Write a protein that binds this ligand. Sequence first.
Ligand SMILES: COc1ccc2c(c[n+](C)c3c4cc5c(cc4ccc23)OCO5)c1OC
Ligand SMILES: [K+]
Ligand SMILES: [Mg+2]
Ligand SMILES: [Os+3]
Ligand SMILES: [Os+3]
Lengths: 215, 225
Amino acid sequence: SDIQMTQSPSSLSASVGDRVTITCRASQSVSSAVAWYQQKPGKAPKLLIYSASSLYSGVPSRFSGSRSGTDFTLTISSLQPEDFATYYCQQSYSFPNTFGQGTKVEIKRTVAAPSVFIFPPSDEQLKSGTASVVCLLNNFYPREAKVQWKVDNALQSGNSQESVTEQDSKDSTYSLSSTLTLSKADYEKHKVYACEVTHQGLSSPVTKSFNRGEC
Amino acid sequence: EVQLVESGGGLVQPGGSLRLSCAASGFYISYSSIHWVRQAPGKGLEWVASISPYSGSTYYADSVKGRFTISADTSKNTAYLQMNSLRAEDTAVYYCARQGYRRRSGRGFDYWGQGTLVTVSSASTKGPSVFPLAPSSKSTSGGTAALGCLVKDYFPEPVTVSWNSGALTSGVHTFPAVLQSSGLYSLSSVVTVPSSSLGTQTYICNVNHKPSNTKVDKKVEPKSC
RNA sequence: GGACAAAGAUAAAAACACAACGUAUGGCGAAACACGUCAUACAGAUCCGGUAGGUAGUCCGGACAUAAACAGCGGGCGCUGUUUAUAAGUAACCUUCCUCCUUAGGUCGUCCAUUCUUUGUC
Ligand SMILES: COc1ccc2c(c[n+](C)c3c4cc5c(cc4ccc23)OCO5)c1OC
Ligand SMILES: [K+]
Ligand SMILES: [Mg+2]
Ligand SMILES: [Os+3]
Ligand SMILES: [Os+3]
C-alpha cells in the first residue's frame, strides 16, 4: 500500500509578520523521512527542510519543522513578502515517494467587491459560426466567488469555463473571466443572457445582463 | 555551481514516445540518487521515478510503471527518462532533481532543474482568432468601462498580448489560457478605462502567436448606438 | 597373621579435533535497494535411557527444539502431517575375533577401578 501525505490547509491567507503553520499527515509511518519545499510561480521547488526538523543550508532561520507521530508541521515564525508561495511536503521513507497536494500562502487583504461586466458575442465571431459571451469579475478579494449563467432565466451547466488571475502586486486582488460557449444557432434562439455573481463583498447577488442583437 | 538542466521536451501525439534528458554539472550523478518529478499545469508535484547510486536500481510510480524507463549514462553525466505509450494525462512540466547527500541533506532533493514541458495532444498548430470584447454601450457616463480582446482557438501555448503596443499596461488583466474540449487554447485580455475616453481614445490589442507565425492587431471600439 | 566369598562406605574415569563459508540487525563507505567493510548475534556441546563393573557434549536409541523440502486442508498468507538435517568424526590411527562384501564388512579392546568397614567359612 502506497503512503499518502495529506496536507492542510490547501490555501492560507496571512499578513507580513504572521506566524504560519502547515501540516502533513501520513497514512503510515514515514519515520523522520519528510521534507518541505517552497515553489514560487513559474519556478522550480526549493528545498526548505529535510529529515522533518533540519534546516537546509542557506534557508532563513525563520523556518522550522516539527514531527509529532505521523504528523509533520512547517512553521514560519514571521512572514516576509518573499515568503508568499506554495509549499509542498514529501515523504521519502519508502518508495514510491509521495508528495502533499500543496498549500498556497497568499496575502490577506480587505474584502473588495467584484465589478462585473458582460460582453456580448462579437459580430466577427458570429460570422465564424460560434458565439462566446464573457463575464468579467474585476478586482475582488477573496478569490472565492460564484458565477452562474442564465439564458432566459434558464441556468446553464457544463457550457462555462472560468479563468482566474494571480493576486495583483498592488491591489492584492483577484480577477476572474467566465466564457459561455454556445453555437451561433443556439445563440440565435434565445434573447436574454445574464451573468449572476455571488461574492462575500456583495450584499446581494449581482446580475449583469444584455439582450441579444441590441445596441 | 551545482546544476541540472532538463531537455528533450516538446509536443508528442498520444501513444507516442519521448525521451527526456537531465544533464548535470558541478557534480557526478554516480554518487547521487536522481529523481524525476512532474507537475501538470495548475496542479501539484508528482513523483515519477528514481535511480539509486552504485546499483542502478530503478523505482517508479504506478502512474508510469511499464511505460516509463529511468536510465543513467555516467560518461555523459546525464540521466534519461524514456516515455512510451504517452497519454493526455501525462502533459506536464518535468523536473529532474538531485537527492542530497545523506550526511548533509538526508533524503531531501537539494537541487532541481528549471523543468521541461511535455504536451501530449493530437492538436495541430493553429493561429488564434481575435475578437473585440467591445465596451458596453450602457457604460456609466463618468464611471469605469471595461473592454477586451478574446484570443480563441490557438494551439499550442503561448500567446502574448499587449495593449496599444504596450503603452497601455495599467488595469490590464491577461487571463491564464484554459484548454477547451476542442483541444485548442483560449484566453481573454481585458482593461478597465474611464468611460469619458471611449470615443476619444483608440484601444488596440496586439496578439502574437509565434508557433503559428501569427501577428494580429485588433482595434476594440464601441458599436453602433 | 593369612586365604576364599558376600554385603557396604568412599574415590576414579576416554585419544585427536571441534568449522561462520553464510544469515539477521546496526554503523560507515559520495550509499533507502544492491555492493564493499566493520560491530554484535546465530552452528542441538538440550532431556531421558543404554553401551553387560563404572566413566559420554561428540557412541547407540527415543523424545523435544530448530531449519529445510514435500504432500494435504482452509480462506502471497495460515494450519496439519510426513521426511531429512542438526557438524567433520567414535572418521583416521593402534588393536581382538568372525565371515569368501576379504584391495572388505562386521565385531572385542583403548579411560577408571582407590581407600576403608562389616559378616560367613577354613
Ligand atoms: C557405561 O558407560 C560407558 C560405556 C561405554 C563408554 C563410555 C564412555 N566412553 C567415553 C566410551 C568410548 C569412547 C571412545 C571410543 C569408544 C568408547 C566406547 C564406549 C564408551 O572410541 C573413541 O572414544 C561410558 O561412560 C559413560
Ligand atoms: K442545455
Ligand atoms: Mg554424529
Ligand atoms: Os497502496
Ligand atoms: Os437554450
